[PDB]
Amino acid sequence: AAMYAIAFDLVVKDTQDYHPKGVQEAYTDIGAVLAKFGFVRTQGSLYTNMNEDMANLFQAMNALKQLAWISQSVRDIRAFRIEQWSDFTD
Amino acid sequence: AAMYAIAFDLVVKDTQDYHPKGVQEAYTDIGAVLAKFGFVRTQGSLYTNMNEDMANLFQAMNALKQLAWISQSVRDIRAFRIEQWSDFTD
Numbered sequence A, B: 001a002a003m004y005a006i007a008f009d010l011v012v013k014d015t016q017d018y019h020p021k022g023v024q025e026a027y028t029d030i031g032a033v034l035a036k037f038g039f040v041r042t043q044g045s046l047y048t049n050m051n052e053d054m055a056n057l058f059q060a061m062n063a064l065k066q067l068a069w070i071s072q073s074v075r076d077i078r079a080f081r082i083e084q085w086s087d088f089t090d
Helices: A018-036 A054-066 B020-034 B054-066
Strands: A003-010 A047-048 A073-086 B003-012 B048-049 B074-086
Touching: A003 A018, A003 A054, A018 A047, A018 A054, A047 A054, A054 B074, A073 B054, B003 B020, B003 B054, B020 B048, B020 B054, B020 B074, B048 B054, B054 B074
Parallel strands: none
Antiparallel strands: A003 A047, A003 A073, A073 B074, B003 B048, B003 B074
């Protein structure tokens, strides 16, 4: 049904080369913070909670940027409300 | 305001190593197909259209998996309706 989704882009220090292992390490670190609030990563890059309590989402967002290391390694935090979600096999 | 979003995961042939340049090449290829329908990539991994015409979204999804190469290099296609979207600087 309906869910909240948290998305973000990592700060890039090296525009010459990719650092995919660095990227996985950041994701699973942010994941640790967000799991305290029931927000858990898709098969993709989005952190989802089917509990659409605004207070829970707010205290997830307080937990991010309250942590100095969160500010200093992320560049865009966004939240969405997702109202539909379908998989296409066809 | 309100938008449609298309998301996907690439088939992974090599579970030992990352292939980030291969991943960018797939994304910009799928991007070429999806841009015919006004669906264009975020700063992240989502393909968005603020035109919420169901027929346009359907003919985007027809264009995907109609292409043999699309089926054979993607493993999960999903669509969402996103009703809110906020950036957090705070």
